[PDB]
């Protein structure tokens, strides 16, 4: 019954939705798990233009990770991120 975020994900365009994977793939170059383990995440800050410690990267996951796995996978990245997008509207 979490359709309020699931329905929102459909609002994503094909360009957005398809490219959603594109950047995700940078983190999971050889990740069998299919998730970002903060170690790979440090690249995420670099994209912006920052290279803070992996532990510091983990905090970014910790704050952002609603499930509390300490990791961010494609599904969490895809749906969890929509948690921010929904923002009571």
């Amino acid at each position: 019954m979490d359709d309020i975020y699931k329905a929102a994900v459909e609002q994503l365009t094909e360009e957005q939705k398809n490219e959603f994977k594109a950047a995700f793939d940078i983190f999971v170059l050889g990740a069998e798990d299919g998730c970002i383990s903060t170690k790979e995440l440090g690249k995420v800050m670099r994209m912006l233009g920052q290279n803070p410690t992996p532990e510091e990267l983990q905090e970014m996951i910790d704050e952002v990770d609603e499930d509390g796995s300490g990791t961010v996978d494609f599904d969490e990245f895809l749906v969890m991120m929509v948690r921010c997008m929904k923002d009571d509207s």
Binding site: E19, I26, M81, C84
Partner: peptide
């Protein structure tokens, strides 16, 4: 996505094509 979506531009450099 969450914001402006820096990830769309994030690729910056690439190989293979």
């Amino acid at each position: 996505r969450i914001s402006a979506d820096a990830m769309m531009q994030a690729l910056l450099g690439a190989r293979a094509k």
